[PDB]
Specification:
alpha/beta; binds (3R,4S)-4-(3-methoxyphenyl)oxan-3-amine; Papain-like protease nsp3
């Protein structure tokens, strides 16, 4: 069902795409959100996914946090995918702009292994401040399930592909 992806490894695929547009097109079983521990989807990928759900993701997330408390950095929760996917896997990668330990990025990607196929952004990339080349490396060395990565920025997508070892 996923189209136009470049195959990086046996299980990792990448495309220059807006993950919101990609999710609406594919309606995957799982779309990954670049979440924070409070599930406050203000900006970056989370703000864009939440805005596509007309804020239903945020309303659901606030109820989740009221019941369960915050997630751990490196952790995740499965919530509804709303109009984007069957489910949304909210994964918290470390935020370098909050001084969080980059070593938690591998733990964050391990959450992907609980799902056979996922549409995902690069964890801790963008406003999370980590090097996206490093995020892609950790992704291919950690995720064993089938991951379709959507990279919004064309220039970053080209840099990721051209530098992939
Ligand atoms: C909003 O998206 C939804 C909602 C319900 C089911 C699905 C599945 C997921 C697997 O692929 C087939 C269907 N598109 C997606």
């Amino acid at each position: 069902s996923f189209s136009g992806y470049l195959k990086l490894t046996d299980n990792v695929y990448i495309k220059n795409a807006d993950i919101v547009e990609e999710a609406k097109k594919v309606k995957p079983t799982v779309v990954v959100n670049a979440a924070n521990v409070y599930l406050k989807h203000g900006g970056g990928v989370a703000g864009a996914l939440n805005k596509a759900t007309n804020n239903a993701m945020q309303v659901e997330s606030d109820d989740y946090i009221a019941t369960n408390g915050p997630l751990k950095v490196g952790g995740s929760c499965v919530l509804s995918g709303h109009n984007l996917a069957k489910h949304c896997l909210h994964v918290v990668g470390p935020n370098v702009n909050k001084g969080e330990d980059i070593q938690l990025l591998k733990s964050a990607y391990e959450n992907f292994n609980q799902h056979e196929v996922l549409l995902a952004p690069l964890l801790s990339a963008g406003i999370f401040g980590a090097d996206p080349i490093h995020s892609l490396r950790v992704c291919v060395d950690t995720v064993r399930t089938n991951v379709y990565l959507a990279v919004f920025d064309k220039n970053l997508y080209d840099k990721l592909v051209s530098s992939f070892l």
